[model samples]
Target: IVQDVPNAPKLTGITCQADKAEIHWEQQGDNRSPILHYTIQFNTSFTPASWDAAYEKVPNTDSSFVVQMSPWANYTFRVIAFNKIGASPPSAHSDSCTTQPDVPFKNPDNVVGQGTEPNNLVISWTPMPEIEHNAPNFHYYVSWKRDIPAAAWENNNIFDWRQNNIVIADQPTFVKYLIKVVAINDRGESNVAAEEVVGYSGEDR
Candidate 1:
């Protein structure tokens, strides 16, 4: 038989960690030439889900490779065998792997509050983009306090991130309050709080 590039590899499985993943594979068919090395490629959970370039070169002696990973991402990997002749066709995609989730990385922004009716205050904020909510069971945490010396914050939790507004009834009319907003998930609160803003209760018309 004449020598040629190595045959494609068969991906066995994939396992993921908080910040990395491992992909396992084995040879398929046969090659006239001895295999030199392997290359691993992956696709991520972003739009278009394009396959990324090989991040490492695997020697023929190793059947598995550990790949660096990012938080809250889904990945799939494939392998290609190489010899002096050339690289072989890529292997079938492996089982999907998902990295561990973490606390929300970003806080809610565009917060504003104003009075709408007598004794009523309306607080609103821009919801965090879906990507920033790094895990499930996500929501918003809103807090407020009288805009005065030594005032204590009153805590309120919004069970849904899209419920971006809260109405305060029976508040002292025309009084100013300080408002802050944050994103939260099963892991924990956001890395930081949204900028605090001053709002007023409704003035009698």
Candidate 2:
């Protein structure tokens, strides 16, 4: 015996991760027929007729789907429920979702600096070799300190910069200092960047 199609569902909690989108939705139950499965469809546009091809299928019991996302592109999705007779009308498209940027994989290099004068220095780096996925938007943090008692490395000098001048009005003259940088972004920060340079802060040596 034929049965009426199941009802359209509502989607939610859709988040993008790099080249993938994790989506969840609530099922629209039916009294005449039990939902056998569901279909996931995606399109660049959110209009009603843009979902030309079906994306993926999920069993009725599952409420979530992890779909591969197109890189450097935006995507919206809709879900259709299936029953004994046929599939339900596609759900209204969800808001567009794009992949999340990844954590910086490159390490800062060329940790070069000089004693511009006694105990005063202008520190800087050559920046990583063009980070991927529009890394320039990623932020940076800098931190530095004189090796006062020499502890195992554990740190940036500026909270909003790639470079900063180390200046302490009452700074000691003969002590050496340590400096490093960390790259930041929505994904996360990169490894610390530091180096082998003229260690003497006073430049007396």
Candidate 3:
């Protein structure tokens, strides 16, 4: 008897959430050898879409499985069953699934600051684009503190994501302060603290 690669599987269903996607499929045939594993591939809504491998050699042929996913993306999946002979052709593309928005993946970058008139300190950072915000109602959290030891951070919430700079007035002349900025949404703030920078208040007039 001769053995051949398995037949193309059928993608039965898929559902995406904020952080993961559940995929379901059915095996059409294993040819001669028993099906050993499955491979899962995915494509997103981005232009110039490309199918990228999501999982390979998945041990369980249980027909239903879960995989990690990211926010703010539409995903489609396909499956290929593998036997001793070789891998099957990819299954039909699953219906597109949209994931819910989630927390920001990045913090503010290029954080820097300098002195302004009236003993004020002006802190600034590179503004993040809307996509990087990850979720709707995105805003910024600006935290600052004196450079001296044991100084507690003072926090300010800026509802406008476009406003990339903040001015602190009536500061001590020539004193150094630590400043940082982070993006936040209803889901949560970025996973990690933003890079910090030292800023100095204006010299005496």
Candidate 4:
């Protein structure tokens, strides 16, 4: 007796998020035979890796898979269908996708200064929005330069702080300085926000 093979399903849409990608497709006409499962493969190039290991097999029933990906890496994906008889040919390859690198956080609105005592200046800013565990975390960078002629501002060094309120103290005495804050993440440093202050003697009239 002659037996007939089943046809593969037709893929419809595909999308990518920060760490994962989703795929959707429609089952082909199979009145007599139904699709048993699907095979998904991924690679850096359109052509198979090698004749022996050109594509990797993922879960059959699952239409989507969250493949672990490296940041800033490009990847290509393809899908195929299978039945009780055998596996069908792979569908047309999908467009390539790449993950984005982590970005530095931004400062909050309406930042103010405190601790105006001589030789001391306190500066604070708001925190960044919370993100996923794998997502990048925020860090703060603070620097200052004295404003007086012949007397430059003291270098307080970059104060690395987490996502929270910050306090800087014991600046140079009787020195005017320009302070600034910046946010950093795994990617790099963010834009700097300049904060200026002039130190004065509390005992002066």
Candidate 5:
């Protein structure tokens, strides 16, 4: 007598690179007829699925399949086995994955400044919403120029990105100093406004 349809193969691994994702799995069952092909499905949701048109399917003779996926979106993948007998049960769902991280398009917001005691200015800002797959690594690029009877040369420097607040030192007393902060991450640096500030130490006024 012909054997019953084989059970689904078990997924062993799943991963994504760029806009594509690949899967690996074990054989459907022992002593089963030779496999004809495989059935795979994917979607953005974690909810259990019945494999409808909503989910994209990768079908063929390949042991595994590469599916279309995009950066920064969450996705779930699973597979089924098929043979001359019939389609097997669906395999276990693959662990969730988010496409590789990409540079952030939006800049940080609510940047503000104030004068601190002698020779110093303090600046603080609010972080923008999630930019990509990874928590952003921040870098503060501060630029400053002195305004006076004789304006001084402009200078720029990088500082720790973790702090929401930063204090600039060595400012000239009695002279107006203008400054701006730019945020940077693996995704990319953010846009700054006419974000420059004009200010002075207490002694200046």
Candidate 6:
């Protein structure tokens, strides 16, 4: 004996992010015979050569689902309604959705200061804003060169500090050297921020 099936619902509002896709749709005419579940199929081709039969059998509970998707992959998806009898015809396919690149974390605001004592210099700065799902850490680069512009600071045997604050004891040695700070995280390093130069004085008090 032939059994009746519900007509496939119309899918809409398909949006994709870096690692996920949100799908929503309107309920179709299933009042005569309630829909027991939906069979959602997806593939990476315009005309799905072989549907990844791992159908998402969502019961008649919600009208939306967030699907995890591979980055930079093109996908086409469609859904069908089913009752106790069997599944209905597949609905119109959804427009292709492709995942985009993730946004990099931003660096913290810079801090600047000068030496309090003749032979010592104090440096400090605030940390970057807390990352959503990761720990917060900062990597700093400190350097000083004689008779050179602050811009001339190269990656040469320059001192590097990863702490939030530091104190330099030999201030006279870097008297003509330019000071600067930069922050970094798993995302990447931030732009360099230059500090005022500290001049040299022969005598130490």
Q: Name model 4 segments beyond 4 Å from true.
A: 45-65, 101-205
Tell me which residue pairs clash in candidate 6.
Answer: none
lDDT of 2 by residue, 101-131 (tens): 5666544555544455675544566554222
Local distance difference test scores for all models = 0.81, 0.62, 0.82, 0.52, 0.60, 0.57
- Give the least accurate 10-residue stretch of model 5, judged by summed lDDT: 127-136
lDDT (Cα, tens digit) per residue for candidate 1, span 140-162: 98899988899999989898766
Q: After superposition, how far is residue 66 of candidate 1 from its true place, in Å?
A: 16
Which residue pairs come into collision in candidate 3? none
Total clashes in model 1, counting residue pairs 3 or more apart in sequence or in different chains? 0
**Candidate 5 vs. true structure, TM-score:** 0.42
Per-model TM-score on C-alpha atoms: 0.55, 0.44, 0.57, 0.40, 0.42, 0.45
In candidate 6, stretches whose alpha carbon ends up further than 4 angstroms from where it belongs are: 1-3, 53-55, 100-205
User: Highest TM-score: which candidate?
Assistant: 3
User: In model 3, which runs have C-alpha deviations exceeding 4 angstroms?
Assistant: 106-133, 136-189, 195-205
Write down the worst ten-residue block by lDDT for model 1. Answer: 47-56
Q: Model 2: what TM-score?
A: 0.44
* Model 2: per-residue Cα lDDT at residue 8: 84
How do the residues 130-157 of candidate 4 rate in per-residue lDDT, one tens digit apiece?
A: 3311125445555555555676544332
How many pairs of residues collide in model 2? 5
Candidate 3 per-residue lDDT over residues 90-124, each given as its tens digit: 99898887777889989888887677675888888
Clash counts per candidate, in order, are: 0, 5, 0, 2, 1, 0
**In terms of lDDT, which candidate is strongest?**
3
Q: After superposition, how far is residue 169 of candidate 1 from its true place, in Å?
A: 0.7
